[PDB]
Amino acid sequence: MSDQEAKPSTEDLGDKKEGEYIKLKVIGQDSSEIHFKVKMTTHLKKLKESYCQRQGVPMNSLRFLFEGQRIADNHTPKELGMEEEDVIEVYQEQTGG
């Protein structure tokens, strides 16, 4: 009973069962278009972390901005309606956050 009868395909599938995924690209002075198919309901704190990981710096280093507005990290990208933007940039956290 303890051993499963078969391994499921849930971790193995990649299409999220024909579900939606984010297409937003964050492109700072790093000049790279690295982005992943995560769901649109995550908070920007995790993206802040993942971008700082592409530079090898802690998450307190950078904040995102687009249309002139730097944004607060507890938003989700669907709150801001930005889930497929061609470019959002980063700028340094001048005094941290």
Side-chain angles (χ1 to χ4, degrees):
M1 192 177 190
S2 307
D3 200 357
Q4 68 188 1
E5 68 185 306
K7 188 176 178 63
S9 306
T10 42
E11 302 179 71
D12 193 66
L13 68 86
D15 76 327
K16 296 179 174 61
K17 302 187 184 182
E18 306 181 296
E20 75 294 326
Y21 57 92
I22 203 169
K23 297 189 182 188
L24 186 175
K25 298 183 294 184
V26 265
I27 308 166
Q29 296 295 310
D30 289 287
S31 313
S32 58
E33 300 191 276
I34 302 166
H35 67 292
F36 303 97
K37 297 193 179 183
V38 297
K39 66 191 181 189
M40 304 175 183
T41 57
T42 56
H43 298 98
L44 266 296
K45 299 181 184 183
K46 192 64 176 178
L47 191 65
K48 190 195 188 74
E49 183 192 296
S50 309
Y51 198 107
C52 295
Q53 288 175 339
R54 92 170 65 168
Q55 297 188 342
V57 300
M59 72 183 290
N60 196 34
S61 308
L62 297 169
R63 182 173 293 272
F64 300 107
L65 79 172
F66 68 114
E67 307 301 341
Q69 301 190 104
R70 296 182 187 179
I71 64 173
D73 298 298
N74 201 47
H75 291 296
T76 61
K78 66 185 293 180
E79 280 172 54
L80 300 173
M82 67 180 196
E83 311 104 304
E84 62 181 50
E85 290 302 298
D86 187 63
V87 52
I88 295 186
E89 299 185 16
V90 291
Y91 196 83
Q92 66 191 268
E93 289 269 61
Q94 296 176 233
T95 57

Coordinates of all heavy atoms in Angstrom, one line a residue:
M1 N 0.8 -1.2 0.0 CA 0.0 0.0 0.0 C 0.9 1.3 0.0 O 0.5 2.2 -0.7 CB -1.0 0.0 1.2 CG -2.0 1.1 1.1 SD -3.2 0.9 2.5 CE -4.5 2.0 2.0
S2 N 1.9 1.3 0.8 CA 2.8 2.5 0.8 C 3.4 2.9 -0.5 O 3.6 4.1 -0.8 CB 3.9 2.3 1.9 OG 3.3 1.9 3.1
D3 N 3.9 1.9 -1.3 CA 4.5 2.2 -2.5 C 3.4 2.6 -3.6 O 2.4 1.8 -3.7 CB 5.3 1.0 -3.0 CG 6.4 1.4 -4.0 OD1 6.5 2.5 -4.4 OD2 7.2 0.5 -4.3
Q4 N 3.6 3.6 -4.3 CA 2.6 4.1 -5.3 C 2.5 3.0 -6.4 O 3.5 2.4 -6.7 CB 2.9 5.4 -5.8 CG 4.2 5.5 -6.7 CD 4.6 6.9 -7.1 OE1 4.0 7.9 -6.7 NE2 5.7 7.0 -7.8
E5 N 1.3 2.8 -7.0 CA 1.2 1.8 -8.1 C 1.7 2.2 -9.4 O 2.1 1.4 -10.2 CB -0.3 1.5 -8.2 CG -1.3 2.5 -8.8 CD -2.7 2.0 -8.7 OE1 -3.0 1.0 -9.3 OE2 -3.6 2.7 -8.1
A6 N 1.9 3.5 -9.6 CA 2.5 4.1 -10.9 C 3.0 5.5 -10.5 O 2.4 6.1 -9.6 CB 1.5 4.1 -12.0
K7 N 4.0 6.0 -11.2 CA 4.4 7.4 -11.1 C 3.5 8.3 -11.9 O 3.2 8.0 -13.1 CB 5.9 7.5 -11.5 CG 6.5 8.8 -11.3 CD 8.0 8.8 -11.7 CE 8.7 10.1 -11.5 NZ 8.8 10.6 -10.1
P8 N 3.0 9.4 -11.3 CA 2.1 10.2 -12.1 C 2.9 11.0 -13.2 O 4.1 11.0 -13.2 CB 1.5 11.1 -11.0 CG 2.6 11.3 -10.0 CD 3.1 9.9 -9.9
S9 N 2.2 11.7 -14.0 CA 2.8 12.5 -15.1 C 2.7 14.0 -14.8 O 3.1 14.8 -15.6 CB 2.1 12.3 -16.4 OG 2.0 10.9 -16.7
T10 N 2.3 14.3 -13.6 CA 2.0 15.7 -13.2 C 3.2 16.6 -13.1 O 3.1 17.8 -13.4 CB 1.4 15.6 -11.8 OG1 2.2 14.7 -11.0 CG2 0.0 15.2 -11.8
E11 N 4.4 16.1 -12.7 CA 5.6 16.9 -12.7 C 6.3 16.9 -14.0 O 7.1 17.7 -14.4 CB 6.6 16.3 -11.6 CG 6.0 16.2 -10.2 CD 6.9 15.6 -9.2 OE1 7.9 16.3 -8.8 OE2 6.7 14.5 -8.7
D12 N 6.0 15.8 -14.8 CA 6.6 15.6 -16.1 C 6.1 16.4 -17.2 O 6.8 16.7 -18.2 CB 6.5 14.1 -16.4 CG 7.4 13.7 -17.6 OD1 8.7 13.8 -17.4 OD2 6.9 13.3 -18.6
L13 N 4.8 16.7 -17.2 CA 4.1 17.4 -18.3 C 4.6 18.9 -18.3 O 5.0 19.4 -17.2 CB 2.6 17.4 -18.1 CG 1.9 18.0 -16.9 CD1 1.5 19.5 -17.2 CD2 0.6 17.3 -16.6
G14 N 4.6 19.5 -19.4 CA 5.2 20.9 -19.5 C 4.2 21.9 -20.0 O 4.4 23.1 -19.8
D15 N 3.0 21.5 -20.5 CA 2.1 22.4 -21.1 C 1.0 23.0 -20.1 O 0.1 23.7 -20.5 CB 1.3 21.8 -22.2 CG 0.2 20.8 -21.7 OD1 0.4 20.1 -20.7 OD2 -0.8 20.7 -22.3
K16 N 1.1 22.6 -18.9 CA 0.1 23.0 -17.8 C -1.3 22.6 -18.2 O -2.2 23.4 -17.9 CB 0.2 24.5 -17.5 CG 1.6 24.9 -16.8 CD 1.6 26.3 -16.5 CE 2.9 26.7 -15.8 NZ 4.2 26.3 -16.6
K17 N -1.4 21.5 -18.9 CA -2.7 21.1 -19.5 C -3.4 22.2 -20.3 O -4.6 22.6 -20.0 CB -3.6 20.5 -18.4 CG -3.0 19.4 -17.6 CD -4.1 18.8 -16.6 CE -3.6 17.7 -15.8 NZ -4.6 17.1 -14.9
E18 N -2.7 22.7 -21.3 CA -3.1 23.7 -22.2 C -3.5 25.0 -21.5 O -4.3 25.8 -21.9 CB -4.3 23.3 -23.1 CG -4.0 22.0 -23.8 CD -5.2 21.5 -24.7 OE1 -6.3 21.2 -24.2 OE2 -5.0 21.5 -26.0
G19 N -2.8 25.3 -20.3 CA -3.1 26.4 -19.5 C -2.3 27.7 -19.9 O -1.4 27.6 -20.7
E20 N -2.6 28.8 -19.3 CA -1.9 30.1 -19.6 C -0.6 30.2 -18.9 O -0.4 29.5 -17.9 CB -2.8 31.3 -19.2 CG -3.0 31.6 -17.7 CD -3.7 30.6 -16.9 OE1 -4.6 29.9 -17.4 OE2 -3.3 30.4 -15.7
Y21 N 0.3 31.0 -19.4 CA 1.6 31.2 -18.8 C 2.1 32.6 -19.1 O 1.6 33.3 -20.0 CB 2.6 30.2 -19.2 CG 2.9 30.1 -20.7 CD1 3.9 30.9 -21.3 CD2 2.1 29.3 -21.5 CE1 4.2 30.8 -22.7 CE2 2.4 29.2 -22.9 CZ 3.4 30.0 -23.5 OH 3.7 29.9 -24.8
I22 N 3.0 33.2 -18.2 CA 3.4 34.6 -18.4 C 4.4 34.7 -19.6 O 5.2 33.7 -19.9 CB 4.1 35.0 -17.1 CG1 4.1 36.6 -17.0 CG2 5.5 34.5 -16.9 CD1 4.5 37.2 -15.7
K23 N 4.3 35.8 -20.4 CA 5.2 36.0 -21.5 C 6.1 37.2 -21.4 O 6.8 37.6 -22.3 CB 4.4 36.0 -22.8 CG 3.7 34.7 -23.1 CD 3.1 34.6 -24.5 CE 2.4 33.3 -24.8 NZ 1.9 33.2 -26.2
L24 N 5.9 37.9 -20.2 CA 6.7 39.1 -19.9 C 8.2 38.9 -19.9 O 8.7 37.8 -19.4 CB 6.2 39.4 -18.4 CG 6.6 40.7 -17.7 CD1 5.9 40.7 -16.3 CD2 8.1 40.9 -17.4
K25 N 8.9 39.8 -20.5 CA 10.4 39.7 -20.5 C 11.0 40.9 -19.7 O 10.7 42.0 -20.0 CB 10.9 39.8 -22.0 CG 10.5 38.6 -22.9 CD 11.0 38.7 -24.3 CE 10.6 39.9 -25.1 NZ 11.0 40.0 -26.5
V26 N 11.9 40.6 -18.8 CA 12.6 41.6 -18.0 C 14.0 41.6 -18.6 O 14.7 40.6 -18.6 CB 12.6 41.4 -16.5 CG1 11.5 42.2 -15.8 CG2 12.5 39.9 -16.1
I27 N 14.4 42.8 -19.1 CA 15.6 43.0 -19.8 C 16.2 44.3 -19.3 O 15.9 45.4 -19.6 CB 15.3 43.2 -21.4 CG1 14.5 42.0 -21.9 CG2 16.7 43.3 -22.1 CD1 13.9 42.3 -23.3
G28 N 17.2 44.1 -18.4 CA 17.9 45.3 -17.8 C 19.2 45.5 -18.7 O 19.3 45.0 -19.8
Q29 N 20.1 46.2 -18.1 CA 21.4 46.5 -18.7 C 22.2 45.2 -18.9 O 23.2 45.1 -19.7 CB 22.3 47.4 -17.8 CG 21.7 48.8 -17.6 CD 21.6 49.6 -18.9 OE1 22.6 49.7 -19.6 NE2 20.5 50.1 -19.1
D30 N 21.8 44.1 -18.3 CA 22.3 42.7 -18.6 C 22.1 42.3 -20.1 O 22.8 41.5 -20.6 CB 21.6 41.7 -17.8 CG 22.0 41.7 -16.3 OD1 23.1 41.3 -16.0 OD2 21.2 42.2 -15.5
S31 N 21.1 42.9 -20.7 CA 20.8 42.8 -22.2 C 20.6 41.3 -22.5 O 21.1 40.8 -23.5 CB 21.9 43.4 -23.0 OG 22.2 44.7 -22.5
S32 N 19.8 40.6 -21.7 CA 19.4 39.2 -21.9 C 17.9 39.1 -21.7 O 17.3 39.9 -20.9 CB 20.2 38.3 -21.0 OG 20.0 38.7 -19.6
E33 N 17.2 38.2 -22.3 CA 15.8 38.1 -22.4 C 15.2 36.9 -21.6 O 14.2 36.3 -21.9 CB 15.3 38.0 -23.8 CG 15.7 39.1 -24.7 CD 15.0 39.1 -26.1 OE1 15.4 38.4 -27.0 OE2 13.9 39.8 -26.2
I34 N 16.0 36.5 -20.6 CA 15.7 35.3 -19.8 C 14.3 35.4 -19.1 O 14.1 36.4 -18.4 CB 16.8 35.1 -18.7 CG1 18.2 34.9 -19.4 CG2 16.5 33.8 -17.8 CD1 19.4 35.0 -18.4
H35 N 13.4 34.5 -19.4 CA 12.1 34.5 -18.8 C 11.6 33.0 -18.8 O 12.0 32.2 -19.7 CB 11.1 35.4 -19.5 CG 10.8 35.1 -20.9 ND1 11.7 35.1 -22.0 CD2 9.6 34.7 -21.5 CE1 11.1 34.7 -23.1 NE2 9.8 34.5 -22.8
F36 N 10.7 32.7 -17.9 CA 10.2 31.3 -17.7 C 8.7 31.3 -17.7 O 8.1 32.3 -17.5 CB 10.7 30.9 -16.3 CG 12.3 30.9 -16.2 CD1 12.9 32.0 -15.6 CD2 13.0 29.9 -16.7 CE1 14.3 32.1 -15.5 CE2 14.5 29.9 -16.6 CZ 15.1 31.0 -16.0
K37 N 8.1 30.2 -18.0 CA 6.6 30.0 -18.2 C 5.8 29.9 -16.9 O 4.9 29.1 -16.8 CB 6.3 28.8 -19.1 CG 6.8 28.9 -20.5 CD 6.1 27.8 -21.3 CE 6.5 27.9 -22.8 NZ 5.8 26.8 -23.6
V38 N 6.2 30.7 -15.8 CA 5.5 30.6 -14.6 C 4.1 31.2 -14.7 O 3.7 31.9 -15.6 CB 6.3 31.3 -13.4 CG1 7.6 30.5 -13.2 CG2 6.6 32.7 -13.7
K39 N 3.2 30.8 -13.8 CA 1.8 31.3 -13.7 C 1.8 32.8 -13.4 O 2.8 33.4 -12.8 CB 1.0 30.5 -12.7 CG 1.5 30.7 -11.2 CD 0.8 29.6 -10.3 CE 1.3 29.8 -8.9 NZ 0.9 28.7 -8.0
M40 N 0.7 33.5 -13.7 CA 0.6 35.0 -13.6 C 0.2 35.5 -12.2 O 0.0 36.7 -12.0 CB -0.3 35.5 -14.6 CG 0.0 35.1 -16.0 SD -1.3 35.6 -17.2 CE -0.8 35.0 -18.7
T41 N 0.0 34.6 -11.2 CA -0.5 34.9 -9.9 C 0.6 35.0 -8.8 O 0.3 35.2 -7.7 CB -1.5 33.8 -9.5 OG1 -0.9 32.5 -9.5 CG2 -2.7 33.7 -10.4
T42 N 1.9 34.8 -9.2 CA 2.9 34.9 -8.2 C 3.2 36.4 -7.9 O 3.0 37.2 -8.7 CB 4.2 34.3 -8.8 OG1 4.5 35.0 -10.1 CG2 4.1 32.8 -9.1
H43 N 3.8 36.7 -6.7 CA 4.1 38.1 -6.4 C 5.4 38.4 -7.0 O 6.3 37.6 -7.2 CB 4.0 38.3 -4.9 CG 2.7 38.0 -4.3 ND1 2.3 36.9 -3.7 CD2 1.6 38.8 -4.2 CE1 1.1 36.9 -3.3 NE2 0.6 38.1 -3.6
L44 N 5.7 39.7 -7.2 CA 6.9 40.2 -7.9 C 8.1 40.0 -7.0 O 9.2 40.0 -7.5 CB 6.8 41.7 -8.2 CG 6.3 42.1 -9.6 CD1 7.3 41.6 -10.7 CD2 4.9 41.5 -10.0
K45 N 8.0 39.8 -5.7 CA 9.1 39.4 -4.8 C 9.9 38.2 -5.4 O 11.1 38.3 -5.4 CB 8.6 39.1 -3.4 CG 7.9 40.2 -2.7 CD 7.5 39.8 -1.3 CE 6.7 40.9 -0.6 NZ 6.3 40.5 0.8
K46 N 9.2 37.2 -5.9 CA 10.0 36.1 -6.4 C 10.7 36.4 -7.7 O 11.8 36.0 -8.0 CB 9.1 34.9 -6.6 CG 9.8 33.5 -6.9 CD 10.7 33.0 -5.8 CE 11.2 31.7 -6.1 NZ 12.2 31.2 -5.0
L47 N 10.1 37.3 -8.6 CA 10.8 37.7 -9.8 C 12.0 38.5 -9.4 O 13.1 38.4 -10.1 CB 9.9 38.4 -10.8 CG 10.4 38.6 -12.2 CD1 10.6 37.3 -12.9 CD2 9.5 39.5 -13.0
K48 N 11.9 39.4 -8.4 CA 12.9 40.2 -7.9 C 14.1 39.4 -7.5 O 15.3 39.6 -7.9 CB 12.4 41.1 -6.7 CG 13.3 42.2 -6.2 CD 12.8 42.5 -4.8 CE 13.4 43.8 -4.2 NZ 13.0 45.1 -4.8
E49 N 13.8 38.3 -6.8 CA 14.8 37.3 -6.4 C 15.5 36.7 -7.7 O 16.7 36.6 -7.8 CB 14.2 36.3 -5.5 CG 15.2 35.2 -5.0 CD 14.4 34.1 -4.4 OE1 13.7 34.2 -3.3 OE2 14.5 32.9 -4.9
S50 N 14.7 36.2 -8.6 CA 15.2 35.5 -9.8 C 16.0 36.4 -10.7 O 17.0 35.9 -11.2 CB 14.1 34.9 -10.6 OG 13.2 34.1 -9.7
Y51 N 15.7 37.6 -10.8 CA 16.5 38.5 -11.6 C 17.8 38.8 -10.9 O 18.9 38.8 -11.5 CB 15.8 39.9 -11.9 CG 16.4 40.6 -13.0 CD1 15.8 40.7 -14.3 CD2 17.7 41.2 -12.9 CE1 16.4 41.3 -15.4 CE2 18.3 41.8 -14.0 CZ 17.7 41.8 -15.2 OH 18.4 42.3 -16.3
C52 N 17.8 39.0 -9.6 CA 19.0 39.2 -8.8 C 19.9 38.0 -8.9 O 21.1 38.1 -9.0 CB 18.7 39.7 -7.4 SG 17.9 41.3 -7.3
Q53 N 19.3 36.8 -8.9 CA 20.1 35.6 -9.2 C 20.8 35.5 -10.5 O 21.9 35.0 -10.6 CB 19.2 34.4 -9.0 CG 18.8 34.1 -7.5 CD 17.8 32.9 -7.4 OE1 17.1 32.6 -8.3 NE2 17.8 32.4 -6.2
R54 N 20.3 36.2 -11.6 CA 21.0 36.2 -12.9 C 22.2 37.0 -12.8 O 23.2 36.9 -13.6 CB 20.1 36.6 -14.1 CG 20.1 38.1 -14.5 CD 19.4 38.4 -15.8 NE 18.0 38.1 -15.8 CZ 17.1 38.4 -16.8 NH1 17.4 39.1 -17.9 NH2 15.8 38.1 -16.6
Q55 N 22.3 37.9 -11.8 CA 23.5 38.7 -11.6 C 24.4 38.2 -10.5 O 25.6 38.5 -10.4 CB 23.1 40.2 -11.2 CG 22.4 40.9 -12.3 CD 22.2 42.4 -11.9 OE1 22.4 42.8 -10.8 NE2 21.9 43.2 -12.9
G56 N 23.9 37.3 -9.7 CA 24.6 36.7 -8.6 C 24.7 37.7 -7.4 O 25.7 37.7 -6.7
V57 N 23.6 38.4 -7.2 CA 23.5 39.4 -6.1 C 22.3 39.2 -5.2 O 21.4 38.5 -5.7 CB 23.5 40.9 -6.7 CG1 24.8 41.2 -7.5 CG2 22.3 41.1 -7.5
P58 N 22.2 39.6 -4.0 CA 21.0 39.3 -3.2 C 19.8 40.1 -3.7 O 19.9 41.1 -4.4 CB 21.4 39.8 -1.8 CG 22.3 40.9 -2.0 CD 23.2 40.4 -3.2
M59 N 18.6 39.6 -3.3 CA 17.4 40.2 -3.8 C 17.1 41.7 -3.5 O 16.4 42.4 -4.2 CB 16.1 39.4 -3.5 CG 15.7 39.4 -2.0 SD 14.3 38.3 -1.7 CE 12.9 39.1 -2.5
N60 N 17.7 42.2 -2.4 CA 17.7 43.6 -2.1 C 18.4 44.6 -3.1 O 18.4 45.8 -2.9 CB 18.3 43.8 -0.7 CG 17.9 45.2 -0.1 OD1 16.8 45.7 -0.2 ND2 18.8 45.7 0.7
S61 N 19.0 44.0 -4.1 CA 19.7 44.9 -5.1 C 19.0 45.7 -6.1 O 19.4 46.7 -6.5 CB 20.7 44.0 -5.8 OG 21.5 43.2 -4.9
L62 N 17.8 45.2 -6.6 CA 17.1 45.7 -7.8 C 15.6 45.9 -7.6 O 15.0 45.1 -6.8 CB 17.4 44.8 -9.0 CG 18.8 44.6 -9.5 CD1 18.8 43.5 -10.5 CD2 19.4 45.8 -10.1
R63 N 15.0 46.8 -8.4 CA 13.6 46.9 -8.4 C 13.2 47.1 -9.9 O 14.0 47.7 -10.6 CB 13.2 48.1 -7.6 CG 11.7 48.4 -7.5 CD 11.3 49.5 -6.5 NE 11.7 49.1 -5.1 CZ 10.9 48.4 -4.3 NH1 9.6 48.1 -4.6 NH2 11.3 48.0 -3.1
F64 N 12.0 46.6 -10.3 CA 11.6 46.7 -11.7 C 10.9 48.0 -11.9 O 10.3 48.6 -11.1 CB 10.5 45.6 -11.9 CG 11.1 44.2 -11.7 CD1 10.6 43.5 -10.6 CD2 12.0 43.7 -12.6 CE1 11.2 42.2 -10.4 CE2 12.6 42.4 -12.4 CZ 12.2 41.6 -11.2
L65 N 11.0 48.5 -13.2 CA 10.3 49.7 -13.6 C 9.9 49.6 -15.1 O 10.6 49.0 -16.0 CB 11.2 51.0 -13.4 CG 12.3 51.4 -14.4 CD1 12.8 52.8 -14.0 CD2 13.5 50.4 -14.3
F66 N 8.7 50.2 -15.4 CA 8.2 50.3 -16.8 C 7.3 51.5 -16.8 O 6.6 51.8 -15.8 CB 7.6 49.1 -17.3 CG 6.3 48.6 -16.7 CD1 5.1 48.7 -17.4 CD2 6.3 48.2 -15.3 CE1 3.9 48.2 -16.8 CE2 5.1 47.8 -14.7 CZ 3.9 47.8 -15.5
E67 N 7.2 52.2 -17.9 CA 6.4 53.4 -18.1 C 6.8 54.5 -17.1 O 6.0 55.3 -16.7 CB 4.9 53.2 -18.2 CG 4.4 52.1 -19.1 CD 4.8 52.4 -20.6 OE1 5.1 53.5 -21.0 OE2 4.7 51.4 -21.4
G68 N 8.1 54.5 -16.7 CA 8.6 55.4 -15.7 C 8.3 55.1 -14.3 O 8.9 55.6 -13.4
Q69 N 7.4 54.1 -14.0 CA 7.1 53.7 -12.7 C 7.9 52.6 -12.2 O 7.8 51.5 -12.7 CB 5.6 53.4 -12.6 CG 4.7 54.5 -13.0 CD 3.2 54.2 -12.7 OE1 2.6 54.8 -11.8 NE2 2.6 53.4 -13.5
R70 N 8.6 52.8 -11.1 CA 9.1 51.7 -10.3 C 7.9 51.1 -9.6 O 7.0 51.8 -9.2 CB 10.2 52.2 -9.3 CG 11.4 52.8 -9.9 CD 12.4 53.2 -8.8 NE 13.5 54.0 -9.4 CZ 14.5 54.5 -8.7 NH1 14.8 54.3 -7.5 NH2 15.4 55.3 -9.4
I71 N 7.9 49.8 -9.3 CA 6.8 49.1 -8.8 C 7.0 48.4 -7.4 O 8.2 48.0 -7.1 CB 6.1 48.1 -9.8 CG1 7.1 46.9 -10.1 CG2 5.7 48.9 -11.1 CD1 6.6 45.8 -11.0
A72 N 6.0 48.3 -6.6 CA 6.0 47.6 -5.3 C 6.0 46.1 -5.6 O 5.3 45.6 -6.5 CB 4.9 48.1 -4.4
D73 N 6.8 45.4 -4.8 CA 7.0 44.0 -5.0 C 5.9 43.0 -4.6 O 5.9 41.9 -5.1 CB 8.3 43.5 -4.4 CG 9.5 44.3 -4.9 OD1 9.9 44.2 -6.1 OD2 10.2 45.0 -4.1
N74 N 5.0 43.4 -3.7 CA 3.9 42.6 -3.3 C 2.7 42.6 -4.3 O 1.7 41.9 -4.1 CB 3.4 42.9 -1.9 CG 2.7 41.7 -1.3 OD1 3.1 40.6 -1.4 ND2 1.5 41.9 -0.7
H75 N 2.9 43.2 -5.5 CA 1.8 43.1 -6.5 C 2.1 41.7 -7.2 O 3.2 41.2 -7.1 CB 2.0 44.2 -7.6 CG 1.6 45.5 -7.1 ND1 0.3 45.9 -6.7 CD2 2.4 46.7 -6.9 CE1 0.3 47.2 -6.3 NE2 1.5 47.6 -6.4
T76 N 1.0 41.2 -7.8 CA 1.2 40.1 -8.8 C 1.3 40.8 -10.2 O 0.8 41.9 -10.3 CB 0.0 39.1 -8.8 OG1 -1.2 39.8 -9.1 CG2 -0.1 38.5 -7.4
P77 N 1.8 40.2 -11.2 CA 1.8 40.9 -12.5 C 0.5 41.1 -13.1 O 0.2 42.0 -13.9 CB 2.8 40.1 -13.4 CG 2.6 38.7 -12.9 CD 2.5 38.8 -11.4
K78 N -0.5 40.2 -12.8 CA -1.9 40.4 -13.3 C -2.6 41.6 -12.6 O -3.5 42.1 -13.3 CB -2.7 39.1 -13.1 CG -2.9 38.6 -11.7 CD -3.6 37.2 -11.7 CE -5.0 37.2 -12.2 NZ -5.6 35.9 -12.2
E79 N -2.2 42.0 -11.5 CA -2.8 43.2 -10.9 C -2.4 44.4 -11.7 O -3.2 45.4 -11.8 CB -2.2 43.5 -9.5 CG -2.8 42.7 -8.3 CD -2.0 42.9 -7.1 OE1 -1.8 44.1 -6.7 OE2 -1.5 41.9 -6.5
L80 N -1.2 44.4 -12.3 CA -0.7 45.5 -13.0 C -1.0 45.4 -14.5 O -0.8 46.3 -15.3 CB 0.8 45.6 -12.8 CG 1.2 45.8 -11.3 CD1 2.7 45.8 -11.2 CD2 0.8 47.2 -10.8
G81 N -1.5 44.2 -15.0 CA -1.8 44.0 -16.4 C -0.6 44.0 -17.3 O -0.7 44.5 -18.4
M82 N 0.5 43.5 -16.8 CA 1.8 43.5 -17.5 C 2.3 42.2 -18.0 O 3.5 42.0 -18.2 CB 2.8 44.3 -16.6 CG 3.2 43.5 -15.4 SD 4.3 44.5 -14.4 CE 5.0 43.3 -13.4
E83 N 1.4 41.1 -18.0 CA 1.9 39.7 -18.1 C 2.5 39.3 -19.4 O 3.0 38.2 -19.6 CB 0.7 38.8 -17.8 CG -0.1 39.2 -16.6 CD -1.4 39.8 -16.9 OE1 -1.4 40.9 -17.6 OE2 -2.5 39.4 -16.5
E84 N 2.5 40.2 -20.4 CA 3.1 39.9 -21.7 C 3.9 41.0 -22.3 O 4.2 41.1 -23.5 CB 2.0 39.4 -22.7 CG 0.9 40.4 -23.0 CD -0.1 39.9 -24.0 OE1 -0.7 38.8 -23.7 OE2 -0.5 40.6 -25.0
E85 N 4.4 41.9 -21.4 CA 5.2 43.0 -21.9 C 6.5 42.6 -22.6 O 7.2 41.7 -22.2 CB 5.6 44.0 -20.7 CG 4.4 44.7 -20.2 CD 3.7 45.6 -21.2 OE1 4.4 46.5 -21.8 OE2 2.5 45.4 -21.6
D86 N 6.8 43.3 -23.7 CA 8.1 43.1 -24.4 C 9.3 43.5 -23.7 O 10.4 42.9 -23.8 CB 8.0 43.9 -25.7 CG 9.1 43.5 -26.7 OD1 9.2 42.4 -27.1 OD2 9.9 44.4 -27.0
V87 N 9.2 44.6 -22.9 CA 10.3 45.0 -22.1 C 9.9 45.7 -20.8 O 9.1 46.7 -20.8 CB 11.3 45.9 -22.9 CG1 10.6 47.1 -23.6 CG2 12.5 46.4 -22.0
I88 N 10.4 45.2 -19.7 CA 10.3 45.9 -18.4 C 11.8 45.8 -18.0 O 12.5 44.9 -18.3 CB 9.4 45.1 -17.4 CG1 8.0 45.1 -17.9 CG2 9.5 45.7 -15.9 CD1 6.9 44.6 -17.0
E89 N 12.3 46.9 -17.4 CA 13.7 47.0 -17.1 C 13.9 46.9 -15.5 O 12.9 46.9 -14.8 CB 14.3 48.3 -17.6 CG 14.2 48.5 -19.1 CD 14.9 49.8 -19.5 OE1 15.7 50.4 -18.8 OE2 14.7 50.3 -20.7
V90 N 15.1 46.9 -15.1 CA 15.4 47.0 -13.6 C 16.2 48.3 -13.4 O 16.9 48.8 -14.3 CB 16.2 45.8 -13.1 CG1 15.3 44.5 -13.1 CG2 17.5 45.5 -13.9
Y91 N 16.2 48.7 -12.2 CA 17.1 49.8 -11.7 C 17.5 49.5 -10.3 O 16.7 48.9 -9.6 CB 16.4 51.2 -11.8 CG 17.3 52.3 -11.7 CD1 18.0 52.8 -12.9 CD2 17.6 53.0 -10.5 CE1 18.9 53.9 -12.8 CE2 18.5 54.1 -10.5 CZ 19.1 54.6 -11.6 OH 19.9 55.7 -11.7
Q92 N 18.7 49.8 -9.9 CA 19.2 49.5 -8.5 C 18.4 50.1 -7.4 O 17.8 51.2 -7.5 CB 20.7 49.9 -8.4 CG 20.9 51.4 -8.5 CD 22.4 51.7 -8.6 OE1 23.1 51.9 -7.6 NE2 22.9 51.8 -9.8
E93 N 18.3 49.4 -6.3 CA 17.7 49.9 -5.1 C 18.7 50.8 -4.4 O 19.7 50.3 -3.9 CB 17.3 48.7 -4.2 CG 16.2 47.8 -4.6 CD 14.9 48.3 -4.1 OE1 14.4 49.4 -4.4 OE2 14.2 47.5 -3.4
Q94 N 18.5 52.1 -4.6 CA 19.6 53.1 -4.2 C 19.9 53.0 -2.8 O 21.1 53.2 -2.4 CB 19.0 54.5 -4.6 CG 18.8 54.7 -6.1 CD 18.2 56.0 -6.5 OE1 17.2 56.1 -7.2 NE2 18.8 57.1 -6.0
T95 N 18.9 52.8 -1.9 CA 19.1 52.7 -0.5 C 18.5 51.5 0.1 O 18.2 51.4 1.3 CB 18.4 54.0 0.2 OG1 17.1 54.0 -0.2 CG2 19.1 55.3 -0.3
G96 N 18.3 50.5 -0.8 CA 17.7 49.2 -0.4 C 16.2 49.4 -0.3 O 15.6 50.4 -0.6
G97 N 15.5 48.3 0.3 CA 14.1 48.3 0.5 C 13.8 47.4 1.6 O 12.6 46.9 1.7

